[PDB]
Structures are given as C-alpha cells and as structure tokens.
Amino acid sequence: VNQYNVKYSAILFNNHQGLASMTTNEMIKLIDSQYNEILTFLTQIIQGNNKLFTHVYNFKRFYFMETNDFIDAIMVKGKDV
C-alpha cells in the first residue's frame, strides 16, 4: 500500500498538479490504471497467499459430508458420548 501510494502520488502531484489540473481523458486513464493494478494485487493476495479456492474446496469437503470416512470415524468413536 505504501509503495502504491508513492507511485501514484508521483503522478498526481509531481507529473501533474492534482486532480483539478488534469484533463478528463487523462483522469479517466489514471483511474483505469489504478483499478487494474488494485484488482490485480487483490487477486494475487486473496487467490494467492490465502488460497481461496483450496479453502472453498475444504469447506465443501467437510461441511457437505464428502470425506465420509472421517464422519464414520467420529460416529463410531462417539457412539456413546
């Protein structure tokens, strides 16, 4: 976030003099570039380091009964509890 802040402050305040001192075409282009970069990094975290798909698969594996052996083990072990 800090690296991004520096990178795009060097465009808003150094290359230009703020959002006011920007023609609509360049302002739209800047926002589009920021949007692509931000969603690229959001993917690289959420489906990267977090491994969203793997945890959704594990949710389906455990909540939707898929690993029947584990549940059979629970029921046979806890048949008295």
Partner: protein, 404 residues
C-alpha cells in the same frame, strides 16, 4: 476401520502376491516399503501466471512404521515353501514373522486343528497392531488340497475366537480328480456356516474371459472392490456398508463379480455411458450365467478423473430397464464414483460390477450332482451328509427367492 488379509494355499498365495503388488503400485509404495511423495492434486486448481501430506488412506491396509516404511497386513499360510519364497522375493516388504510354513481335506483339517495355537497366536499378533478392526479378507481355493482344509479351519477359528463381532469376507476360487468334489462340498459347508460374504470366482469362466493370467483378473477385481475405502468419497468408504447393500438376508450371501476387460487396448470404451451398458453383458461375468437369471442387487464401480454426470445418469436410466430384477426387490441400480489413483499414468477408465443374482442355482447344482455321483471312521460320512443338506438348504432358498 482396518482390514486384515489372509492367504491360504498355492492359488491363494499366487493371487495375493499380485493383489498386493497392485495395491502397492496404486499407492506409490515401492517393493522395499519406501513411500513416494504425493503428487499435487489435479482438481485442486491454483492461481498461475500466463512431504507427508496425503489425501488417500493407504494405511487402511499397510502398517505405517515409525521409520516411514509400509508393510502389508497379510498372513501367509501354506506348506510348500517355493510359492512363499517367490512371493517374498518379489515383495521384500512382506514381514518374515507373518509367514507360517508346515491332498486329503481331512488331513489338512486335522493338521490345522493340531497346530491351531500357533496360527491363533499369529492372528492375535496381527490384530494387536490394528485399532478399531473392521473385517478379514480371505484368499483361498475351495478345492486344491492345503487351501481347502487350512482355510476352513482358519475360518472356524477366526469366526469363534472373536465372537463373530467383525464381518469376514471370502475371495474363494472355485475349481474348473476323484477328491476334488469332496473338497469343494466340504469347504462350501463352512463357507455357508461362517463366511459373511463370498465372492465366487470360477476358473472356467475366468479362462473364457482371458482368451478374449487367470490370477491377474482375480487380483484386479479384488483390488478394485475396495477402491472407495482407499480413496474415500461421498458414499460407502466402509467395507460393511458396501456388503450390506447387496446381501438382503444372511442366506443370500453369495456374490459374483463382472469385469470390463478393455482397460488398456486403444479401442477402449468411449465414455461412461458406453461402459455402463457394456458392464451388464453376460460374456464378461466371472460366473457362468444363463438368460433365466434375475438380479437381487446391483452395484457398478467407475474409476476415472472428473466423470461426466450426464452420461452416468443416462446410463443408469437405460440400464435399469434392461436388468431383470427379482419381483420383491425394488428396481435399484447404484454406481460408485471411484477416484483413480494419481500415481497411475493410465488415464483410461476402469469399471468393475458386483452382483447378487440367482445364477448360483445352476453352479451349486453342478457341484451337488458331481458330489452325488462320486459318493456312489463313519464320522466323515456324517459330515458329508451334513454338507449335502446344508448346500440343499440354500439351493431351495435361492429357488424360493423367485417368489413373492
């Protein structure tokens, strides 16, 4: 649960060696007991630019030692040491401690009785390594000598030493000499009394399938029956659950298996829909079945990656009409969506069908007729009479199964 495998006789040892080599190949366990790192999952997709972790259950059959070495839960019982030597040489992973070494059925039965304490100690030693035991698996030949008597005595011993609290399967192989019919009937008597579910394999039908060895097919069927147990899925994953779905009453316990041969030829089955229809064919069943047969229960195994659900649904719907169900059993066909082992490079499907039909009437009729022809201290003749009456007790029962 855990499964203990027992192999008796030369034929039983020959089958079991390939059965264990098959399982070791599927689970990536080398012949020396060393384990192979698990390949990454195929359907566990991951983001892309453009060691002990596992998701199977191999330890259900192999004992995982503290040194990361697997060892089968097998017990080898016979008298001739040549077959055991060959089996151990092929698979050094077999525990030498688990090997026990020593024509008339009576002689083998009496030998098993005299030396029952040692075999019982071995069974107890194997059980002690198992927590929450589930069932026993037996690989033996109904006729052939050592296998008949020794397996029958072990059947009785295991049945009565644990109070029948665990089910006991039986992968019996039926014969294709003057003493053979006596052995077949005598062993079948104890199969009726003690065994919980019997997989009947007929050598003549196995030869019929082969010419289109014989032990490899038995090994493949036996190692594919337990696919849901070793690769757990939504359904089953327990040996008692699979058997309970095909045995309506204790008497109708004899199962038979069908095998799809073309697992490797480049003209393999197009899709799951084709294989579902081809499995019902009577030319690939391991037991000779006529056109008057009726099915009491149905179970189909499918082994492949990402099977198409549409094809399976349509195949089940088409196959339900073709099959002639027994009048008092609801029309029900079940398909097992097994998972192929990631270690296997072959991507072709395999499919094994297990059935409980009424074709046993003819098979036991042939056995009974041969026994009656051959019959034409006194204690043994009483046992022969008892075996004759016990076999008739399920002959007439399978006949009555036709009636509401």
């Amino acid at each position: 649960g855990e499964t203990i495998t027992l192999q008796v006789g030369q034929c039983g040892n020959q089958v079991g060696l390939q059965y264990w080599q098959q399982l070791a190949t599927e689970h990536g366990i080398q012949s020396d007991g060393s384990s192979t790192p698990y390949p990454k999952d195929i359907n566990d997709l991951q983001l892309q630019e453009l060691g002990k972790y596992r998701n199977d259950h191999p330890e259900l059959f192999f004992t995982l030692s503290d040194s990361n070495t697997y060892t089968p839960r097998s017990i080898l019982i016979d008298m001739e040491p040549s077959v055991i030597a060959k089996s151990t040489s092929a698979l050094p992973m077999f525990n030498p401690r688990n090997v026990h070494l020593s024509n008339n059925w009576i002689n083998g039965y009496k030998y098993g009785t005299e030396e029952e304490e040692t075999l019982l100690n071995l069974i107890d030693r194997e059980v002690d390594k198992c927590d929450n035991l589930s069932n026993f698996q037996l690989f033996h030949s109904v006729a052939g000598g050592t296998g008949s008597g020794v397996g029958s005595k072990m059947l009785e011993v295991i049945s009565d030493r644990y109070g029948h609290k665990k089910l006991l399967n039986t992968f019996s192989i039926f014969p294709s000499v003057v003493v053979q019919p006596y052995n077949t009937i005598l062993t079948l008597k104890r199969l009726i009394d003690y065994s919980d579910a019997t997989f009947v394999f007929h050598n003549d039908s196995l030869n019929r399938i082969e010419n289109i060895g014989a032990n490899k097919l038995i090994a493949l069927v036996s190692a594919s029956v337990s696919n849901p147990l070793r690769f757990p899925g939504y359904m089953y994953s327990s040996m008692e659950s699979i058997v309970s779905n095909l045995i309506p009453t204790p008497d109708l316990k004899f199962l038979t298996s069908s095998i799809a041969p073309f697992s490797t030829q480049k003209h393999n089955y197009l899709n799951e829909y084709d294989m579902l229809l081809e499995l019902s064919n009577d030319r690939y069943k391991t037991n000779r079945v006529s056109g008057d047969t009726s099915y009491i229960s149905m179970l189909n195994y499918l082994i492949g990656d990402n099977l198409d659900q549409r094809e399976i649904r349509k195949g089940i719907l088409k196959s339900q009409q073709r099959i002639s169900f027994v009048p008092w059993v609801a029309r029900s066909v079940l398909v097992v969506h097994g998972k192929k082992s990631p270690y296997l490079k072959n991507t072709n499907l395999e499919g094994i069908q297990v059935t409980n039909n009424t074709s046993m009437i003819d098979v036991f009729t042939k056995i009974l007729k041969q026994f009656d022809l051959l019959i034409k201290e006194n204690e043994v003749m009483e046992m022969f009479n008892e075996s004759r009456e016990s076999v008739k007790s399920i002959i007439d029962e399978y006949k009555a199964c036709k009636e509401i």
